[PDB]
Short mmCIF file of C-alpha atoms in Angstrom, two decimals:
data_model
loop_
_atom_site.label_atom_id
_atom_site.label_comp_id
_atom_site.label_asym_id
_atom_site.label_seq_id
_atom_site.Cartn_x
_atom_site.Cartn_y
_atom_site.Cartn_z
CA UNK A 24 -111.16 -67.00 38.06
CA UNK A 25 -114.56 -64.97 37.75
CA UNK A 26 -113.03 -61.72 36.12
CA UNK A 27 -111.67 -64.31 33.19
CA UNK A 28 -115.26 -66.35 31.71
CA UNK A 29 -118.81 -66.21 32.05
CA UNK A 30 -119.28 -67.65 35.64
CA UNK A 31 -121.35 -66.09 37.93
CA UNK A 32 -118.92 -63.66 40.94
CA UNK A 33 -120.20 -64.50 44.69
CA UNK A 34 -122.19 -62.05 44.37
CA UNK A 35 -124.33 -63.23 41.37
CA UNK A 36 -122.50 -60.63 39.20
CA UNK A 37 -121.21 -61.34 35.66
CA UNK A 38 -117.70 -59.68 35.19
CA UNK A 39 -117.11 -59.78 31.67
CA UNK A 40 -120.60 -58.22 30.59
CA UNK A 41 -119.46 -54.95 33.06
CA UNK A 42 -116.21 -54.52 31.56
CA UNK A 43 -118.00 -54.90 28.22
CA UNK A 44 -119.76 -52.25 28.81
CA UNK A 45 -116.59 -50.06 29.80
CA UNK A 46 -115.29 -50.82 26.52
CA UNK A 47 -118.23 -48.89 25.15
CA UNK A 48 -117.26 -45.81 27.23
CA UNK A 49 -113.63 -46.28 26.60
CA UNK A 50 -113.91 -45.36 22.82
CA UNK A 51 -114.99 -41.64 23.11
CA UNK A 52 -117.92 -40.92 21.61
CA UNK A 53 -121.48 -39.84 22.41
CA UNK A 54 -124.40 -40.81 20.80
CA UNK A 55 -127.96 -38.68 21.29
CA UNK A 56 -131.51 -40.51 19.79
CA UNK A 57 -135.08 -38.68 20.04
CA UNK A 58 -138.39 -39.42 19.06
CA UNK A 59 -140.98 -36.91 18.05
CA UNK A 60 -144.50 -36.13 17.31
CA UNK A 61 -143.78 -37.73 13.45
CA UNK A 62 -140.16 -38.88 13.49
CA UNK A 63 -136.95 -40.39 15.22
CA UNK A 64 -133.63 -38.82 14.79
CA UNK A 65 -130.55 -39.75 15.96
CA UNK A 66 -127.54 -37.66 16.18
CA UNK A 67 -124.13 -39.15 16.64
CA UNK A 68 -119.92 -37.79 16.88
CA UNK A 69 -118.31 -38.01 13.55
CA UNK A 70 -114.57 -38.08 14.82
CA UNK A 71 -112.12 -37.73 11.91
CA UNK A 72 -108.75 -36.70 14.09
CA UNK A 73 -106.23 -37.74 11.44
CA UNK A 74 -106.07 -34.68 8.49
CA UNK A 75 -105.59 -37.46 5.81
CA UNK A 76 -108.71 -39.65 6.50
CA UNK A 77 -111.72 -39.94 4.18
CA UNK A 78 -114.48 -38.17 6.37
CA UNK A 79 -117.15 -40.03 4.32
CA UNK A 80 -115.77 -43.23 4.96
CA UNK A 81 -115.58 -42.80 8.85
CA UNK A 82 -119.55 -43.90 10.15
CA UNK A 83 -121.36 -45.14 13.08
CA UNK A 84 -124.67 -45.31 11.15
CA UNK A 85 -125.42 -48.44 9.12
CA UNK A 86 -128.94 -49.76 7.23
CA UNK A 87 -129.81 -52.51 8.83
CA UNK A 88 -132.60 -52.90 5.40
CA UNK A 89 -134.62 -50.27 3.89
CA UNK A 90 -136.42 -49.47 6.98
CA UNK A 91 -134.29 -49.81 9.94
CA UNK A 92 -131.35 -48.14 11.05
CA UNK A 93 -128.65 -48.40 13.62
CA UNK A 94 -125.57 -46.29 15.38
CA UNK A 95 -123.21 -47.93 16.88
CA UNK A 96 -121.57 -46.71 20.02
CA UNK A 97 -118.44 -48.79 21.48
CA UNK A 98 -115.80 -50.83 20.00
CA UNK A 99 -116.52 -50.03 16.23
CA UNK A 100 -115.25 -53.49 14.78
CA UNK A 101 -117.74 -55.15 17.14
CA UNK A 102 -120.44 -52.89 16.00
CA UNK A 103 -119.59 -54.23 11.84
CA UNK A 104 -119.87 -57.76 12.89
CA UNK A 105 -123.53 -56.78 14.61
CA UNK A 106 -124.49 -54.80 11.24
CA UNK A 107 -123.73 -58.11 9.50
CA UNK A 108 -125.90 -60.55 12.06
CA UNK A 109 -128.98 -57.98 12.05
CA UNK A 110 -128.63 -57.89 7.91
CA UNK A 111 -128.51 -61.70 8.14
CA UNK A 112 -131.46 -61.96 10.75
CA UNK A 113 -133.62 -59.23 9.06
CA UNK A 114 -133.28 -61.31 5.74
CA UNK A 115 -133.68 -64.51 6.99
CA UNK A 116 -136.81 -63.31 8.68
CA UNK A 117 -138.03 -61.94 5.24
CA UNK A 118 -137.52 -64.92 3.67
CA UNK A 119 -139.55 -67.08 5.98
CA UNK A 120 -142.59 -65.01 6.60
CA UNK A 121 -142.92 -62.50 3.20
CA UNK A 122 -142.67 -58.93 5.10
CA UNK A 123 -139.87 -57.14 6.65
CA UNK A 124 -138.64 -57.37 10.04
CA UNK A 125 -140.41 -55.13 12.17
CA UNK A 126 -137.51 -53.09 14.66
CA UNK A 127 -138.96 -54.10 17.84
CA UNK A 128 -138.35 -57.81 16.81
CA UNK A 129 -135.13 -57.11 15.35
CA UNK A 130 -133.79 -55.80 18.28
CA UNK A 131 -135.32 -58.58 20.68
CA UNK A 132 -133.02 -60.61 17.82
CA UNK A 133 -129.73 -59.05 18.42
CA UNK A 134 -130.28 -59.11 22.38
CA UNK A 135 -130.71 -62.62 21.96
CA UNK A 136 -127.19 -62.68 20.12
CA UNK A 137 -125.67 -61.30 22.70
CA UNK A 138 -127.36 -63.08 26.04
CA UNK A 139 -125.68 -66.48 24.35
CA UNK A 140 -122.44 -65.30 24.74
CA UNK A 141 -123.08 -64.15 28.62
CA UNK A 142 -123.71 -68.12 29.08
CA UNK A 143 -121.86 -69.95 26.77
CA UNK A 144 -117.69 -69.39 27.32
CA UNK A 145 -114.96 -69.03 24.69
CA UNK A 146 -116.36 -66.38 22.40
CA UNK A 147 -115.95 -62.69 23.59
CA UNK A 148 -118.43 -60.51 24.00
CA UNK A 149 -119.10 -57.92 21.76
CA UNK A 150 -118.29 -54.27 23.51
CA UNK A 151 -121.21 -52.46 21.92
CA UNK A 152 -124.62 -50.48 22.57
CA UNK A 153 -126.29 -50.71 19.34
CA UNK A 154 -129.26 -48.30 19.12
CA UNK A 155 -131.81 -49.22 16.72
CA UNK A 156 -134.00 -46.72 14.73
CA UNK A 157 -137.24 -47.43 12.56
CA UNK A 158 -141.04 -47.14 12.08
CA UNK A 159 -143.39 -49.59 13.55
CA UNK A 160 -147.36 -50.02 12.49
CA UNK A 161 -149.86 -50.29 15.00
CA UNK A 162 -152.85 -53.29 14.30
CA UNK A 163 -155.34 -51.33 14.99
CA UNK A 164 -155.49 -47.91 12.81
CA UNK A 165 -152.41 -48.90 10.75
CA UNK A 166 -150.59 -45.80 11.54
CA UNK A 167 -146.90 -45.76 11.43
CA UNK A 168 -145.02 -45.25 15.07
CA UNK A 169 -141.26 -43.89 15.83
CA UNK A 170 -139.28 -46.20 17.96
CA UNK A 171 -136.09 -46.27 18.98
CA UNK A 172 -134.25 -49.82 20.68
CA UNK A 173 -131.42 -50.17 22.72
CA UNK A 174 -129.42 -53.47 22.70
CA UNK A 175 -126.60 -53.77 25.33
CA UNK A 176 -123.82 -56.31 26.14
CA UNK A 177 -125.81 -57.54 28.50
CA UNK A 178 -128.66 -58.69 25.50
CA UNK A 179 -130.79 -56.11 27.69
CA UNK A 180 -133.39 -54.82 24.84
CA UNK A 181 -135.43 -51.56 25.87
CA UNK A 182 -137.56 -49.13 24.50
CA UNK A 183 -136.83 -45.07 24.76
CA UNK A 184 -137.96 -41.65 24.71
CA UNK A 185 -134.45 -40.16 24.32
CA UNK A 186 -131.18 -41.85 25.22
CA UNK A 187 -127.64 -40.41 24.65
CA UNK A 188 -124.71 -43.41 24.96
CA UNK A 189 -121.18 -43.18 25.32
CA UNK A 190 -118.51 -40.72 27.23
CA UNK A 191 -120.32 -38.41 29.28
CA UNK A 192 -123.81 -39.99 28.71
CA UNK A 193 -124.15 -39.36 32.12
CA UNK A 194 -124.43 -35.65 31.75
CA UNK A 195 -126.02 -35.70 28.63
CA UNK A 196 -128.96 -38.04 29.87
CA UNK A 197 -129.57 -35.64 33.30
CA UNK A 198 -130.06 -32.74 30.60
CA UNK A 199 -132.03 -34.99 28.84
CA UNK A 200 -134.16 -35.24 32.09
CA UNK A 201 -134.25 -31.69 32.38
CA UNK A 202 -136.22 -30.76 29.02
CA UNK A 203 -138.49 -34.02 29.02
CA UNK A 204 -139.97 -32.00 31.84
CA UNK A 205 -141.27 -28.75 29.71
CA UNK A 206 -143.07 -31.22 26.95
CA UNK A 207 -143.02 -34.54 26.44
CA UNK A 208 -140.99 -35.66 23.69
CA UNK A 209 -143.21 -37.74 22.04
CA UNK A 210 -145.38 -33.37 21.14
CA UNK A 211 -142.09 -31.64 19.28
CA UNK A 212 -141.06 -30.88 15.81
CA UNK A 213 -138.44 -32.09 13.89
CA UNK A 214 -137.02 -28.97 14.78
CA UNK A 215 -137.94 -28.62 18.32
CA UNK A 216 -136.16 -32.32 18.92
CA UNK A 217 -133.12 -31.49 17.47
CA UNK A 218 -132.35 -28.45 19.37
CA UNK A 219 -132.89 -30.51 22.32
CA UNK A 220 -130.65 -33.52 20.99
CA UNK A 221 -127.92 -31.07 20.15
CA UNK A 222 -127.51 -29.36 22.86
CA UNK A 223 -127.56 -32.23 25.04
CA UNK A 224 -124.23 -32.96 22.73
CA UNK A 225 -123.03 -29.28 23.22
CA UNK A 226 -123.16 -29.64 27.46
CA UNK A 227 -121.70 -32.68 27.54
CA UNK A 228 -119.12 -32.11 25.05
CA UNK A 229 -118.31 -29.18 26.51
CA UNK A 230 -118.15 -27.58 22.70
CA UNK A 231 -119.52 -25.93 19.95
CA UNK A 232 -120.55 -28.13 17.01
CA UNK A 233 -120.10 -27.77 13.28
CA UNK A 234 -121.98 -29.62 11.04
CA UNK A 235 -119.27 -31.63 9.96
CA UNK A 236 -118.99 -32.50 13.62
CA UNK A 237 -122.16 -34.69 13.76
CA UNK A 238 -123.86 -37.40 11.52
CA UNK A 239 -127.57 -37.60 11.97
CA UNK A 240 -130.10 -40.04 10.70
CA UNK A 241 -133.74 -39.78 10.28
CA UNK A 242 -136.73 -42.12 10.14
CA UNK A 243 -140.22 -40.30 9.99
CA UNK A 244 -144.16 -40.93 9.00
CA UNK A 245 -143.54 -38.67 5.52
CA UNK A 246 -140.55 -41.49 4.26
CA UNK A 247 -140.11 -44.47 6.53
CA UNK A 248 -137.15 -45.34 5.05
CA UNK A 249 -133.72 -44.50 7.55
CA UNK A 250 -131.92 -42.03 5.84
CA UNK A 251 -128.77 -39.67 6.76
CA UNK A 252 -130.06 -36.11 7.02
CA UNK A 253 -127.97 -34.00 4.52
CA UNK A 254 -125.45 -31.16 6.11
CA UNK A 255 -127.74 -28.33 4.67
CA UNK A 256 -130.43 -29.75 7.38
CA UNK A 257 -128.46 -29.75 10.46
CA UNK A 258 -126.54 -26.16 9.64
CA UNK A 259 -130.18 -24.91 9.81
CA UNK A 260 -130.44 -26.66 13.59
CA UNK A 261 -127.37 -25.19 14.78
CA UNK A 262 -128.12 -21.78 13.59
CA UNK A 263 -131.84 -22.01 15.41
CA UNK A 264 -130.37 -22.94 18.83
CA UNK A 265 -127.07 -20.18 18.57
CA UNK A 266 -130.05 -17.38 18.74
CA UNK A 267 -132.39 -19.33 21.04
CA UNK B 5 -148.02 -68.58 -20.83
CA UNK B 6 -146.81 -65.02 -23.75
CA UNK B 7 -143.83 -63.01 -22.54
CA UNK B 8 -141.30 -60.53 -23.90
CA UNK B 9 -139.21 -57.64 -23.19
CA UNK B 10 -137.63 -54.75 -25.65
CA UNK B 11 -135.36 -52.12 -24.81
CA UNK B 12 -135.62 -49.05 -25.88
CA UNK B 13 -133.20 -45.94 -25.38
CA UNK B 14 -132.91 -45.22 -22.11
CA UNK B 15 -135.20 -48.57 -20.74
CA UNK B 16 -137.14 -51.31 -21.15
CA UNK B 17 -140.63 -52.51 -21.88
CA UNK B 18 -141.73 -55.92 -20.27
CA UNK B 19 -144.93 -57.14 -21.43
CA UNK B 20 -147.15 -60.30 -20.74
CA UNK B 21 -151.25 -61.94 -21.10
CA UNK B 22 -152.63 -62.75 -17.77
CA UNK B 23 -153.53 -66.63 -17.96
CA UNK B 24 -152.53 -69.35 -15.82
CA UNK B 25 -154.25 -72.60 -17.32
CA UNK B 26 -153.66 -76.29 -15.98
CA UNK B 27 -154.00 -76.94 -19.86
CA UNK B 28 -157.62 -77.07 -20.94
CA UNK B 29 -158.76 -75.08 -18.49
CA UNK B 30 -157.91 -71.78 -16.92
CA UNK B 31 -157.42 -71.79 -12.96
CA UNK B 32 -156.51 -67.58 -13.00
CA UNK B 33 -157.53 -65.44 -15.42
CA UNK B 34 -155.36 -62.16 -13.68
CA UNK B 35 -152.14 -63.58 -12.90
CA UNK B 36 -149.34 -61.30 -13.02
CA UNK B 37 -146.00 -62.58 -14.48
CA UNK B 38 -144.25 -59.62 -14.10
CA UNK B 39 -142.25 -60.09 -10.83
CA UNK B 40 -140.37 -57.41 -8.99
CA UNK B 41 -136.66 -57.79 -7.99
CA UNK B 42 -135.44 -54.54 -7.31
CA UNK B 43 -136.85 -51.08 -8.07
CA UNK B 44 -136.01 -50.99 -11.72
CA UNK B 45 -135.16 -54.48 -12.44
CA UNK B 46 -138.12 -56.92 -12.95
CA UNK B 47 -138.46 -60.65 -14.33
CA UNK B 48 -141.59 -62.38 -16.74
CA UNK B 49 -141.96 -65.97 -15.72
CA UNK B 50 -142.99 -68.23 -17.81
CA UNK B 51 -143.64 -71.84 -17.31
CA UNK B 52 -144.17 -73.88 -13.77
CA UNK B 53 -145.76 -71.06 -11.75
CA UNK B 54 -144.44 -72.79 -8.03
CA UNK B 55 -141.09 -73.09 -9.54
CA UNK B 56 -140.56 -68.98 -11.06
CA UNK B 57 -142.17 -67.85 -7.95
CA UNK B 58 -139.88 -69.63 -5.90
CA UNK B 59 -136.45 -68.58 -7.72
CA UNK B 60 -138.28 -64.56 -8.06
CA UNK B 61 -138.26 -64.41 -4.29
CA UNK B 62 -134.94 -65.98 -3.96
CA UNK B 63 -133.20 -63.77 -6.61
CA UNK B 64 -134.78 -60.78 -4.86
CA UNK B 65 -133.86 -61.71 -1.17
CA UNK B 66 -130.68 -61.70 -2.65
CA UNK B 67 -130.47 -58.39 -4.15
CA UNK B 68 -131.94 -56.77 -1.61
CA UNK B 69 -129.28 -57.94 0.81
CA UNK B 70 -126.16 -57.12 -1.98
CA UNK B 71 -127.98 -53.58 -2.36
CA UNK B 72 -127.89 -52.81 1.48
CA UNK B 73 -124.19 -53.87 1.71
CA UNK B 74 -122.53 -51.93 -1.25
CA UNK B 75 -125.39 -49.57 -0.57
CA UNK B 76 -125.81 -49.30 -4.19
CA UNK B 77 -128.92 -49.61 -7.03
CA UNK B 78 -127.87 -53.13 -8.62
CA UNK B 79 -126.47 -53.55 -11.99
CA UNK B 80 -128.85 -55.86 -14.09
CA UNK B 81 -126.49 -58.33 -14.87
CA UNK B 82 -126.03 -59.08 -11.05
CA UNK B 83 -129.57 -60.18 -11.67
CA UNK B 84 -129.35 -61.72 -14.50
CA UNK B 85 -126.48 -64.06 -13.18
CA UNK B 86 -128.07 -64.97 -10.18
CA UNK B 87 -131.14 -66.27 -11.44
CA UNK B 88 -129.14 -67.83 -14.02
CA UNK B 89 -127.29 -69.64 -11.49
CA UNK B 90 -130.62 -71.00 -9.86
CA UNK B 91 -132.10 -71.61 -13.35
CA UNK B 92 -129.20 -73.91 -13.56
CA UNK B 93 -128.10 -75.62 -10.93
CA UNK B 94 -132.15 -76.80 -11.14
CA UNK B 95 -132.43 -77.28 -14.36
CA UNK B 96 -133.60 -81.06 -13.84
CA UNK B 97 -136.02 -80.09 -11.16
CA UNK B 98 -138.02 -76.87 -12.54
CA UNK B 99 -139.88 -75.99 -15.90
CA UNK B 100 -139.12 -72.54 -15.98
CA UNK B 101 -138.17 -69.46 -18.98
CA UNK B 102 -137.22 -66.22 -17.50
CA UNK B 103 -136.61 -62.99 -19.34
CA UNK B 104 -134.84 -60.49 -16.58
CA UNK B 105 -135.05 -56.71 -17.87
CA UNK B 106 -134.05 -53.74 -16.15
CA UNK B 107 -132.59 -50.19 -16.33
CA UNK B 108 -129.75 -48.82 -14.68
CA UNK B 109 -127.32 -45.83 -14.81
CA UNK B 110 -124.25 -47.93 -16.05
CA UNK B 111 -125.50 -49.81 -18.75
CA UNK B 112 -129.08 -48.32 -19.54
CA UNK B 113 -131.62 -50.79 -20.16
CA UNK B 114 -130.95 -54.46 -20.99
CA UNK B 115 -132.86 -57.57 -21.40
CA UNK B 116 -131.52 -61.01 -20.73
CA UNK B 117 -133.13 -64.47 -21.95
CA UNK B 118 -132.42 -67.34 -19.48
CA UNK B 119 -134.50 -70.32 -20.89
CA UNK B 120 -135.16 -73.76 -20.12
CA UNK B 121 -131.57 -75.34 -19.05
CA UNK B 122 -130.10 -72.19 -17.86
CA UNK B 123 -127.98 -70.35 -20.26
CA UNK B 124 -128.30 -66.22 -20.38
CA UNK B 125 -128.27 -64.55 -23.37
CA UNK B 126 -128.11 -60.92 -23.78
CA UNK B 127 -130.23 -59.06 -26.31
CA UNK B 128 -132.50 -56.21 -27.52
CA UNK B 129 -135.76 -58.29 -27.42
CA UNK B 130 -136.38 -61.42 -26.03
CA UNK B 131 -139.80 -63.61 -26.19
CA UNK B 132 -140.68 -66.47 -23.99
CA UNK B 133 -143.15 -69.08 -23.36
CA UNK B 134 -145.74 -71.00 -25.43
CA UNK B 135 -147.14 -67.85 -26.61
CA UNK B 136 -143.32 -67.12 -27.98
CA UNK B 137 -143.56 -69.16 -31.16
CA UNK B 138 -146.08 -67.06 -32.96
CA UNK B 139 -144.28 -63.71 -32.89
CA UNK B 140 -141.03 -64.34 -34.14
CA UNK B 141 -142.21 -63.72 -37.62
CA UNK B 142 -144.18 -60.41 -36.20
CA UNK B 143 -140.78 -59.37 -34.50
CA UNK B 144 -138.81 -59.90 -37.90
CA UNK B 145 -141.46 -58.16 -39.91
CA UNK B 146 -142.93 -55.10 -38.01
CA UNK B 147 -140.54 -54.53 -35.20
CA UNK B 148 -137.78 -51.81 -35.10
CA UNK B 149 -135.20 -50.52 -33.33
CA UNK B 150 -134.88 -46.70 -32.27
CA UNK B 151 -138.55 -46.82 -30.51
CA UNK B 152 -139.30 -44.85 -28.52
CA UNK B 153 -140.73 -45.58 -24.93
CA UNK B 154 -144.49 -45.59 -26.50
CA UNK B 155 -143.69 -46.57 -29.40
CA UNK B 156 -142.28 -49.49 -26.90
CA UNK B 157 -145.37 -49.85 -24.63
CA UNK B 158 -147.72 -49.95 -28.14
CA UNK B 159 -145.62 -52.29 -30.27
CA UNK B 160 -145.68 -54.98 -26.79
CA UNK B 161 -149.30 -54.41 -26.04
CA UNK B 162 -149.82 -55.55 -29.55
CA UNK B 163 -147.52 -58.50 -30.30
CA UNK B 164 -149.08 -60.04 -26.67
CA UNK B 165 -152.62 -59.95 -28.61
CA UNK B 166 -151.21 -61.57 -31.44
CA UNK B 167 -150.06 -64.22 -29.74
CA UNK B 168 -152.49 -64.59 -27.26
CA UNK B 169 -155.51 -64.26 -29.45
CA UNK B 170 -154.01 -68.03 -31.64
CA UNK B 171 -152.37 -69.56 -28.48
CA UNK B 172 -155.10 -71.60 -26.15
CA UNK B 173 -152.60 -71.16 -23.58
CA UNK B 174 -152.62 -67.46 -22.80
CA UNK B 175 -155.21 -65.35 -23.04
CA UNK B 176 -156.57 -62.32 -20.43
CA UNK B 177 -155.66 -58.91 -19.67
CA UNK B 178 -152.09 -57.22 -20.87
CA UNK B 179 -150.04 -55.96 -18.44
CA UNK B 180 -146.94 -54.13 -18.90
CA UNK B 181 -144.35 -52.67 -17.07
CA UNK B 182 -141.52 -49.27 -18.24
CA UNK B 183 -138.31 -49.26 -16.59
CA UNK B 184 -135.87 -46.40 -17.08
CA UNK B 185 -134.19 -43.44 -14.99
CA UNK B 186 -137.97 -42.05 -14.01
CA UNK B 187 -140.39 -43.88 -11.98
CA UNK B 188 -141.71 -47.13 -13.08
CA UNK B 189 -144.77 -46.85 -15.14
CA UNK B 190 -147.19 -50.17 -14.83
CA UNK B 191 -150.28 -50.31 -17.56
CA UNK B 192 -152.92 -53.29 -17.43
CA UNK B 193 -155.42 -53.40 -20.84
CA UNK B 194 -158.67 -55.59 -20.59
CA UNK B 195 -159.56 -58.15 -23.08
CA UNK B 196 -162.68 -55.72 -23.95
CA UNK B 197 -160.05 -53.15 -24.95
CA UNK B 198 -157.40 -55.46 -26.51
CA UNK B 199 -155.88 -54.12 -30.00
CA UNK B 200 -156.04 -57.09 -31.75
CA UNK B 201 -158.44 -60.01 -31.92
CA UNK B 202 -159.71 -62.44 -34.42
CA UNK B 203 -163.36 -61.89 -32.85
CA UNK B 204 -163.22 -58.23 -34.10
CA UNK B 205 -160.79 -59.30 -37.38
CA UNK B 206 -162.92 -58.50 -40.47
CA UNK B 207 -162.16 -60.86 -42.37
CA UNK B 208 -162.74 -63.48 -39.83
CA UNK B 209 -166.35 -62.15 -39.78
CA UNK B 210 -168.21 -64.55 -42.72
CA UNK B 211 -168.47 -68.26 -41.93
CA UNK B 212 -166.76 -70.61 -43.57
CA UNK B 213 -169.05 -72.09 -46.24
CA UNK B 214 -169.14 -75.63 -44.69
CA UNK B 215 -172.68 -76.29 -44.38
CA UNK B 216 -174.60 -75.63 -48.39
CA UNK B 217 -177.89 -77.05 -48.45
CA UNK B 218 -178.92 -79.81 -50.59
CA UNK B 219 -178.63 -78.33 -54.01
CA UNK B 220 -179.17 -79.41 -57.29
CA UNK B 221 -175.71 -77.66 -58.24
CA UNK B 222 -172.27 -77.76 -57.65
CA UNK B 223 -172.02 -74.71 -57.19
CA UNK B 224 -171.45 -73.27 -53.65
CA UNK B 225 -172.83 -70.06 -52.03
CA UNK B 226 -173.70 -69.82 -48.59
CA UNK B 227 -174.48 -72.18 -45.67
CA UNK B 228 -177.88 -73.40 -45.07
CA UNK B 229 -179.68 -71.48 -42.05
CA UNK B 230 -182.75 -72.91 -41.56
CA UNK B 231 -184.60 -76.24 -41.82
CA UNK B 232 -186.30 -77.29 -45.60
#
């Protein structure tokens, strides 16, 4: 009677936000972020099984406005409705205080979206990890920061390093662990980062990737706007971690 | 308030004095009427300066929320027709005349009027506010299509002194604003350095013989100076 709405299980556990989150496992894909020295990149499957579909049409990563970007990882139509409430939220916030929504607060937002339906019963939940992407300015120099925000079904917000989502995160995050040990993220390249994120993909996988293979966005200190990262870019990634 | 916008080939000039005056006298001396909507697509208000503010920033929340979701530059006319739809579904509540202007890759460069009550009218120039009724006569006389893009920025800078230097109500710097496939191109021209006024007009220079002494002849020369 527990497994069916939002009631708290004997054992103070909430059954539809855990199966929520095997929805996000259940659909396939993995999805690596990573924050350098001067950027945040985030590197995502492009599945296109079917010969006959569009490639360009098939996309986890959205605009969420200029500045921010997201990639979706779960239940894709629940992802689109998200897009939609973040565009809504990061334009209603405009409106009412004259800037742009700064990520961290955007993603605080969209937790909060999804905590209501964990206590209110009737609506599903939606079956999605939506990683957030975008530059934040510090008060006190007015430098420009990489961050990188995690929303869960659970309208659990957090901050991250690195953080690969999605079938066989498991494996991807432990190798993850592994080369966070060497040097800290947060002291890489553009460059350095990628061959990191990548091949986090490649072990898990269990693969070799193409370009064509991957879709990879890109917020840095240079342009702060999210943008995708052209297939030129990435080809010249691959290549670098093939010899090293 | 003096406002205008021309196309050219391949863009648009907007153009517009500085003044903001509560009638006799002047509360801001630097306003700036040209109003950003989208990278290449820009509005000069004219009239109530609470009310154009307040439809600017809504026509631009707007756009900026239809560019992220076709993920497309905006078409001019998308901004031209939403404004107009503000301009009049207010039209009893506001004082406002907009001129929306704009370049992009579909239709070039194009310049809408939307004055008071709301219609939208699309032209090659169009000239707004109180400043507005002096250059009509300078735009049928002196102004020409083909111009170039400085040809453009000139002709503006000058037909805003014009008006400005016979209408009480504007007054100030000139600031204009190029729009076309290149970056946008922003120019602001003190009163100290302003083409045309009547201060500097030579034959504006000798007084008006008003004041002749007390003569024992009709005839009339020059004013009296100093005390008899």
């Amino acid at each position: 009677f527990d497994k069916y709405i939002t009631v708290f299980s004997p054992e103070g556990s909430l059954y539809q936000v855990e199966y929520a989150f095997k929805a996000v496992t259940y659909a396939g894909l993995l999805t690596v972020a990573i924050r350098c020295k001067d950027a945040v990149l985030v590197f995502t499957q492009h599945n296109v099984p079917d010969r006959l579909m569009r490639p360009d049409t098939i996309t986890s990563l959205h605009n969420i406005n200029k500045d921010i970007g997201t990639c979706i990882t779960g239940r894709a139509p629940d992802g689109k409705s998200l897009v939609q409430k973040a565009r809504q939220e990061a334009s209603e916030y405009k409106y009412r205080y004259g800037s742009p929504i700064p990520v961290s607060v955007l993603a605080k937002r969209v937790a909060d979206m999804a905590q209501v339906r964990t206590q209110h019963a009737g609506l599903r939940l939606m079956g999605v990890v939506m990683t957030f992407l975008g530059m934040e300015q510090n008060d006190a120099d007015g430098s420009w920061v990489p961050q990188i925000y995690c929303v869960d079904p659970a309208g659990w917000c957090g901050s991250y390093h690195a953080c690969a989502i999605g079938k066989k995160q498991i494996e991807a995050n432990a190798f993850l662990e592994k080369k966070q040990k060497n040097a800290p993220f947060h002291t890489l390249s553009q460059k350095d980062a990628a061959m990191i994120a990548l091949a986090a993909l490649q072990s898990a996988l269990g693969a070799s990737l193409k370009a064509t293979d991957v879709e990879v966005g890109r917020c840095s200190v240079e342009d702060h706007c999210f943008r995708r990262v052209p297939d030129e870019d990435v080809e010249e990634w691959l290549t670098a971690l093939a010899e090293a | 308030t003096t406002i205008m916008a021309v196309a050219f080939k391949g863009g648009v000039v907007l153009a517009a004095d500085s003044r903001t005056s509560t009638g006799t006298y002047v509360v801001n001396r630097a306003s700036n009427k040209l109003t950003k909507l989208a990278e290449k697509i820009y509005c000069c208000r004219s009239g109530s300066a609470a009310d154009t503010q307040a439809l600017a920033e809504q026509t631009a929340n707007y756009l900026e929320s239809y560019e992220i979701d076709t993920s497309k530059p905006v078409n001019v006319t998308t901004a031209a027709n939403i404004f107009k739809k503000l301009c009049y579904m207010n039209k009893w509540n506001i004082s406002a005349g907009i001129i929306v202007a704009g370049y992009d890759p579909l239709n070039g460069g194009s310049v809408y009027s939307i004055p008071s009550g709301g219609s939208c009218v699309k032209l090659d120039y169009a000239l707004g506010g109180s400043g507005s009724i002096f250059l009509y006569s300078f735009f049928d006389a002196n102004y020409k299509t083909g111009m170039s893009k400085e040809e453009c920025v000139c002709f503006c800078q000058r037909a805003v002194a014009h008006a400005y230097s016979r209408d009480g109500s504007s007054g100030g710097l000139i600031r204009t604003i190029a729009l076309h496939q290149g970056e946008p191109e922003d120019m602001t021209i003190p009163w100290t350095k302003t083409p045309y006024c009547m201060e500097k007009d030579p034959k504006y220079r000798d007084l008006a013989v008003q004041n002749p002494p007390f003569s024992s002849s009709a005839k009339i020369t020059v004013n009296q100076s100093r005390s008899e």
